[PDB]
Design a protein around this ligand. Structure first.
Ligand SMILES: O=C(c1cc(Cc2n[nH]c(=O)c3ccccc23)ccc1F)N1CCN(C(=O)C2CC2)CC1
Length: 350
């Protein structure tokens, strides 16, 4: 039996759950008989990303719906969808491109989780929880409830929950201090860079085995840049509820996982509307999506020399913007240093 803490053990079980991976694929209307978990490959997802990038071209250049039909069908050939003997819905718009790009982002993380679980070594004498924990190459420790860092994190959760996200309230079950192998060494060029903030990153439970082993990555070159609001980068939020929406929890699965990462933002490229950029303008290290609401800047605190915007939501004074809340995007994976992993219970009030 495993000597790991019970919350650490429950975390491993949750992220390496094969049925949850299958459930996530079903959600994206994938045909599991034509394409099960085992048949998924980095190559197939990449080829589908490229076919989606072709759909991105047809939509923008106002191509005929009879020319988009073959591009749409090609995507379904690479990624089989559950429609049986019926014709599948037409991928002829930017929304369909975005939705299928999000699916492929998840499939790429699900593939990493499954390859980890099916690769390596099988040993009956060792606890399967301990074996799977080692595969993540991440030091996971339980943060003591009565510690100052736990009080800071709980205040951050409590204060940055938005009114427009009141269909549920949030309960912090566990706070994990995480240390990805080699990540501190990778973050070294940006360790002293100004504007370093502790920000939120919400994702589906089925993506965390991929996130903890490989780190938060950027969508591949094959991915359609127009399917990403501020281009292919790593997205963060200063509001817990904005990130918590990306946990994709329901009444049937109310437990989610959220990250707290130290992001070296530096000189921010402040944007109000969609900008599908491949590269940042000279002298800029990040993009700040200007939201209508911002945490109180006077209420900012410093946890290990890192700014924690745990202030309650106040008006930013930003007019004519497509965002209700701020977002932060970095375009170099070395600019992120993951600090905490939170297990949350979503108490749906609907
Ligand atoms: O951060 C994002 C991302 C997230 C989102 C949604 C989102 N998800 N989670 C958040 O906490 C968040 C905060 C503010 C704004 C958006 C978000 C949209 C586009 C994105 F490129 N990534 C895209 C998916 N990722 C990948 O590694 C894909 C598999 C190759 C991780 C990085």
């Amino acid at each position: 039996k495993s000597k790991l803490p019970k919350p650490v053990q429950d975390l491993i079980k949750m992220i390496f759950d094969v049925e949850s991976m299958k459930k996530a694929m079903v959600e994206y209307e994938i045909d599991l008989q034509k394409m099960p978990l085992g048949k998924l490959s980095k190559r197939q997802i990449q080829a589908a990303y490229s076919i989606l990038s072709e759909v991105q071209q047809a939509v923008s250049q106002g191509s005929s719906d009879s020319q988009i039909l073959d591009l749409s069908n090609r995507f379904y050939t690479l990624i089989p969808h559950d429609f049986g003997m019926k014709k599948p819905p037409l991928l002829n718009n930017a929304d369909s491109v975005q939705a299928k790009a999000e699916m492929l982002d998840n499939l790429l993380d699900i593939e990493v989780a499954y390859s980890l679980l099916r690769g390596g070594s099988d040993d009956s004498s060792k606890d399967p929880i301990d074996v799977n924990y080692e595969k993540l190459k991440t030091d996971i420790k339980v943060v003591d409830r009565d510690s100052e860092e736990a009080e800071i994190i709980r205040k951050y959760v409590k204060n940055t929950h938005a009114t427009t996200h009141n269909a549920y309230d949030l309960e912090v079950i566990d706070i994990f201090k995480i240390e990805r192998e080699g990540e501190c060494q990778r973050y070294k060029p940006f360790k002293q860079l100004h504007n370093r903030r502790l920000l939120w990153h919400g994702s589906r439970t089925t993506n965390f085995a991929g996130i903890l082993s490989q780190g938060l990555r950027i969508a591949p070159p094959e991915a359609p840049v127009t399917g990403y609001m501020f281009g292919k980068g790593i997205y963060f939020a200063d509001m817990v509820s904005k990130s918590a929406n990306y946990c994709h929890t329901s009444q049937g699965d109310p437990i989610g996982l959220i990250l707290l990462g130290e992001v070296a933002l530096g000189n921010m490229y402040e944007l109000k509307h969609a900008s599908h950029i491949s590269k940042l303008p000279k002298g800029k290290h990040s993009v700040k999506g200007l939201g209508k609401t911002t945490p109180d800047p006077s209420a900012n605190i410093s946890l290990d020399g890192v700014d924690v915007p745990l202030g309650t939501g106040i008006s930013s004074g930003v007019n004519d913007t497509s965002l209700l809340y701020n977002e932060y995007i970095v375009y170099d994976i070395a600019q992120v240093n993951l600090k905490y992993l939170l297990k949350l219970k979503f108490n749906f009030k609907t």
